[PDB]
Design a protein around this ligand. Structure first.
Ligand SMILES: OC[C@H]1O[C@@H](O[C@H]2[C@H](O)[C@@H](O)[C@@H](O)O[C@@H]2CO)[C@H](O)[C@@H](O)[C@H]1O
Ligand SMILES: OC[C@H]1O[C@@H](O[C@H]2[C@H](O)[C@@H](O)[C@@H](O)O[C@@H]2CO)[C@H](O)[C@@H](O)[C@H]1O
Lengths: 134, 134
């Protein structure tokens, strides 16, 4: 965990969290983590260019008290190394919604029944350049 | 309670940190802290509408291992309760430079000789809406 870590986010349901940043020239993997704290994540958002046996695949998971849940994978991969990218995230009682920069959108279940998101962290081959709250 | 806290900022000399946010309708005081950690601050930036015996005055200080340094006060006060505001900050070996939204700029000495800013925190009657790097 070398990237930006933010706490006291107070993101509420329906409010969009917009994260923009720079993908390394030789990016292999990058991560955006959201939740209560570092061991309790409603969203581990992990686009893998080539990491852990996945190629050009977004892997999402939850983390409950340090234990990873069951993974969800997405096919579309709107990212390129050496480029800027932007992701928007919101949530409700049921799911998190991830808005991808190619205009694609997908859902990830709110397994931990989180009513507020207080923690974000960036990791991997990504440097945050802008974080915005609606 | 404290607003947004961010660590692993990796702000280098000459790089600009842009913070935009909402001032409470009845704002009395707000704070932006920058430095290494919560006890070691190269910049405590505290516009006071009416707090601690100051009226409409920006109070700046450093904090070295929990101890406040010698205060610096600025006359101009380009802030209004209930409005959005934006501050931009950079630094070099000698000083921090604070760029105010009325176009004013002033300097605060880099007393702790910080070569990198790792930590930021918002506090008081201010809700961060956007943080951007540089
Ligand atoms: O689930 C998120 C974590 O996945 C870990 O890798 C998994 C991998 O995705 C899976 O296919 C299998 O190989 O088991 C691995 C367990 O280590 C990553 O190591 C971790 O960083 C998270 O992304
Ligand atoms: O120096 C920053 C801190 O100031 C504290 O208040 C000062 C006040 O500004 C000064 O005029 C004198 O009265 O001593 C006070 C206590 O040190 C604030 O309480 C603190 O929050 C910082 O802003």
């Amino acid at each position: 965990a070398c990237g930006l870590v933010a706490s006291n986010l107070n993101l509420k349901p329906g409010e969009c969290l917009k994260v923009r940043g720079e993908l390394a020239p030789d990016a292999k993997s990058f991560v955006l983590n959201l939740g209560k704290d570092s061991n309790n994540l409603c969203l581990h958002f992990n686009p893998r260019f080539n990491a852990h046996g996945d190629a050009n695949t977004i892997v999402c998971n939850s983390k409950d008290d340090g234990t990873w849940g069951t993974e969800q994978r997405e096919t579309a991969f709107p990212f390129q190394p050496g480029s800027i990218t932007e992701v928007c995230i919101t949530f409700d009682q049921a799911d998190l919604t991830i808005k991808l920069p190619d205009g694609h959108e997908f859902k990830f279940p709110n397994r931990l029944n989180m009513e507020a998101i207080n923690y974000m962290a960036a990791d991997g081959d990504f440097k945050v350049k802008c974080v915005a709250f609606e």
